[model samples]
Target chain A: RSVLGSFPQVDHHQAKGQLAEVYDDIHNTMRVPWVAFGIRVMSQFPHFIPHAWAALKPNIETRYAEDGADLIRLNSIVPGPVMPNPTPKLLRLGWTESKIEELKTALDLLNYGNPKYLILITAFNEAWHERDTGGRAPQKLRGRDAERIPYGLPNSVEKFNLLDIEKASDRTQTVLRDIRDAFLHHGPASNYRVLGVWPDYLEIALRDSLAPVALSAEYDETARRIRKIAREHVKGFDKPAGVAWRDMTEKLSAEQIAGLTGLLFMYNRFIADITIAIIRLKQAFSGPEDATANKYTN
Target chain B: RSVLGSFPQVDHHQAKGQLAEVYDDIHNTMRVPWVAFGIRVMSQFPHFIPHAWAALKPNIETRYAEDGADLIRLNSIVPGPVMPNPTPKLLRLGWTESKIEELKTALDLLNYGNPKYLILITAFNEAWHERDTGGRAPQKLRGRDAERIPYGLPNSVEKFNLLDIEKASDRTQTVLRDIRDAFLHHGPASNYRVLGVWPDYLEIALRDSLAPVALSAEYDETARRIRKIAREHVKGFDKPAGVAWRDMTEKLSAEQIAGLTGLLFMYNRFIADITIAIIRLKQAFSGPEDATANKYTN
Candidate 1:
C-alpha cells in the first residue's frame, strides 16, 4: 500500500483550481506533453508541488535531456546477455515486419518516457532527502536555457482505454485488470498497454521468458550499472536554486521525506532499467544486428 | 500522473456493493484489518479484485504468517552496523523514556506491517507471473490446511491523529508536509507521526543525518542481504491449488501479468528494507543496548 494518496492526473479538460496552474506550469516549464506520473502524485500536497517544481525546473533547464539521451545511448551500446535474439522465435510465430515495428515504436516510447521520469523522481528523492540540502556552491550550468527535446512519442503510442471491467472486452479487461492489480503503483504502466497490442506475443516473450531474467541477479546488475551512469552525468548537480529541500523540509517531518525518497530512489531506477530491458528484448526479436544501433534515439 | 485511478480506501462503514464484499473478504480471508493499498488500487479495475483475492486466498491460509515471522527474526538477529544506537544523542536532547517508547512503538508497528506486506506482494508477484504455472505435479505442501495467526497489531500503535498542514504548528507543518511529499506511497508513515512528538529532533536526525545513510550503498547492501534471507524461507513454495498463475492467466494476458509481477517483485523487498532502516534509525536514537531485541514482534 502507498504511504501517500495518489491524486488522479487532472486532464487538460478537468484541470480546475490549483491543479490547473500546476499542470500548466509543468507543461510550460518541463516541456513535456503530459505531466509525468511522479509530478501528479506530488500534487496531492499542494504546497510541496511548487517547491518540487522549483528544484526540478532548473535541472530540466540544463543538459538534463541530453544527458538522459546519452545514458540511454550508453546502455543501448551493450546488450545484456539475456536472450540477445528472440526474433527467430517471433518470426517462426509469423510476426510480420510491420507488426514488429509497432512493438519497436512502443519500446521507443517507453525508452523516451522512462528516463525523463527517472530524472523527475530522482530530483524529488534527492531534494526531499536533502541529498542536496547543504546548498553547495552553484555549478557552471546554473541558469542555462532549458533545451527543447521533442518529448513523448505522442503520435506513435497510446494508452489502451482501460475501462470498467464490465465494459472492456474479455481479453483486454482480464489482462488489463490483472496486471494493474499486480503493481503497487496507482495506475497501469504504458509499457503493458503498448504490449497489449500483441497480447499473445507478450505472453510468450515477456511472461514466459524475459520476466524471469528481468527479475534475476543479472538484471539487477544491469540496472545498477545504468543508474550509476545516469547519476554520474549529474555528479555535482545540486537542487535548483529556490527549491532546496532544506528550505522546504521545514514544513514536513524528515522521516516522512526520507521514507518517500527511499521508495522513489529504488523504484525510479528500477523503472528505467525495465524500460531498457524491454527495449533490448524487443531488439532481440527484431534482429541481432539491429540491436546494436541507436534506433530509438531518433 | 498515475496510470490507474485510486479509489478512496473505503472505511468499513463506507464500503458499498462489490467493494464492500471485497473488503469483507480481505479481512476474513487475509486477516488484515484494512485492505492493503495495493488492493484498493487494484479495485479500480473492479473484476480484478475478486480474481486476485481468489489467487491470493490460499497462500494466506498456510504457513505464510509463520514463514514471515521467521524471516523477520533471522534478519533482525544481526543488526546492520549503521549507528546501531541513536539513544545517546536523543538522551542528550532530553527525551524522556516514556516519550522514547512511543516512537519505538511506532517503529515496531512499521516493522510488523512491512514484512507482512512483503509476503502479500510477493504472493501476488509469483502468482501473477505464473510461477506456479505449467502444473508440474504440485509440491508436497500444496493442499495443506490453513492456520490462523490472530493477525494485525490492533490497538498497540495507533496512527497519531495527523492533522492538516495548514492547522499544524509551524515546525510540524513544514517538516511534515515536505517529507510527506518525499515519499511516493499513500500517507505519511506512522514512523514520522510517532517521531513528530519531537519535531526538531526529527528534522535534525532524520533529514540531516539518517536519510543519507538510508540512501547509501551500505543500506542497499543490507537490504539485499535481508531480502535474500526472506526469499530463502519461502523456497519451493508453490501457488495454492486451483489458483495457479496458469489457471488465472487464462483471462489475463501473460505479458501484462509479467510486467506487473516484475514491478512488485522489485518494490516489495524495497518497502521491507525501508521499514527495517527506519527501525534501526529509531534505535540509534534510543540507545545501543535496546537495538538487538525484537521489540516489534511483541
Candidate 2:
C-alpha cells in the first residue's frame, strides 16, 4: 500500500479505503477470511526481512560461543571413570543430563535477573513510535548522540528515544545497567569459565541442589540443535522493535504498575532458561585449573 | 570454484590449491579472519546502508517480536488487568508472547518431543513450510497456518499420504493420517480443532486431535499483531538450515530411534511454553458458546 502510494497516479486515501472495503467484502461473503486476514496479518511482516537476499553458503560459520554450548552438551554424558574430571565445566556440558540441567538454569536466570533491564532498556530502545520507513533518511536516528551512531544511522531513523529517561526510577536505572553489562560482558554463551557470581557455590546448585536433571545425550544434542532453529526468532529483538517497546512503555504513566507487569513476566520467561544453563555449566566445568571460576564439588 | 571453473581462462587445479592456501593464510595467519567475520555478520544484517534506508515503524508491523512481547507486557500491566483471563485456565497470552511461544514450541517440540514424532514432523514441516505472499498465487492463507511458516519455504506442493508411509512405529501412521485429515477436513493448523483439540495443541501433539477453538476479542487481536512479528522472524529460517538437520538425523546409523529421539527433545524445549500458553488461552476464552474447542479442561 505504501509503495503504490509513492507513485503520482495512486491516491493513498482511496487506495486504503478500497483495500479496507475489499478486505471487508471477503471477510463477510466468501467465508475465506484467510485472504483478508492474511493481508491484515502479514501487513505486519517485512520489517525484519533483510532487504537484500543473500547468496547461500555451503558451510555456515558457527557462532562459536553458541555453537560451543552444543559441543559441550554433546560430550556431557561420557561415563568415564571419575578421573579428576579432565573436561572443564563448559566442555563437560556435553550431550548429557548434566549439560541440559546447566543449560536450563542459564536460560531461566537470563529470564529472571534481567526484567528491570529488559523493561528500562527497551524503553530507551523504542523511543520512536511515530516514524514510518516509507521515506526515512539515514541521518534521522534519535538520541543526543544520534549524530554519532557506531555505524552511522540515518537522521530520518526517527527518534525512538524516551523523553523522560532521566526521570525513570532508581530500579529502572539499575536494571538497564545490568542488562547493558550482561550484553557487553557475556561473550558467547560458552563462557562457562566466567561465573556471574562465586563459582564454587554454583556447582552444588546444578548437581545436588537441582532436580535429577535428565536430558539424554541424544536429546541434549537435538535441543541444542535448536540454537539454529530459534536464531531467526531473535531478529524480533532488532532496532525498530526497540522503538516499539519504548513507545508503548512511555505511553504508561509512572503509576501504571499493572500495565508494565507483562514486561516483568516477559523478562523471566525469555531469559531465565538461558541464564540458568550458563550458570549451571559454569558450576559443572571450569575445573579448579581455571582461576576465573573453578570447576568444583557438588 | 564454480566462478573460476566456469571461466575458461582460469586454470582449475592450480587455482583450487592456490586459492585454498591463500584463503587459509588470510583467514589464519594474517588475522584477516576478523575481516571475514565482520563482513559475514554485517551481511546478515538488513540493508542499513548510506542512502537506501527508511525510517523505522515502532508497531508490530516493523518491530521485533521479543520486544513486542515486552511492550505488550508493559502495556497490559499499566491499568492492571493487562490480561483479563480470556480462558478458564486463567491465562491471557497477548500478542508477542503467544506468537513467540508458538514458534518456539513448534521448533522445540520438533527437536524434543517424546517418541521423536515432534522432531520428525518438524523436519517434515520444514520441507512443507509455505508462505502465502498473495502475489497472485493459488492459495491465500491467514489463520494460524500462515503464521506457522518461518522461511521462504514451499518445499513440497503435495500433502503426505498415510497409505504410502512406511515406518517402524504407529506414530508415523497416526501423524500421516491426521495430517491427511487436517488437509482434507480442516485447513492446516485449524485441522486439529476439527478433531476436538486446540489448533495449538495439535501442533504441540500431532495433527490428529485437531480443533479450532475461537480466540477472544483480545486474543484475536493479539494473534493478528503476532502475525507481523512472525513474518519478520521467518526471514531467519531459510534453506541451508534444512540441509543441516537432514544431515544430522540421516547420517546417524542408530536407526529410526535416533531421528525420532532427536525430534522429540527438540520439540519439547522449543514448544513447551507455546503449548502451555495455548492451553491457557483456550481455557479462558473457549466455552460452550464458542465452538473453538470441544473441551478445555481435558
Best by the DockQ measure: 1
On residues B62-170, what C-alpha lDDT tens digit does candidate 2 reach at each position? 2122232322222221111222332222133333557544433332222111111111123222321122111233343334323321221122211111111222224
Q: DockQ (C-alpha) of model 1?
A: 0.06
Question: Against the unseen true structure, what C-alpha lDDT does each candidate score?
Answer: 0.49, 0.25
TM-score of each: 0.55, 0.21
Q: Write the per-residue lDDT of candidate 2 for residues A175-271, one digit (tens) a residue.
A: 3323322322111111121122323333433343222332223223332233222322222221322222222334432212111222222222223
User: Which portions of model 1 show Cα errors greater than 4 Å?
Assistant: A1-64, A75-212, A224-271, A282-298, B1-63, B76-81, B97-102, B121-145, B151-167, B173-187, B200-209, B217-270, B282-298
* C-alpha RMSD (angstroms) for model 2: 26.6
lDDT of 2 at B98: 70
Interface RMSD of predicted model 2: 25.5
> How large an RMSD does model 1 have?
9.9
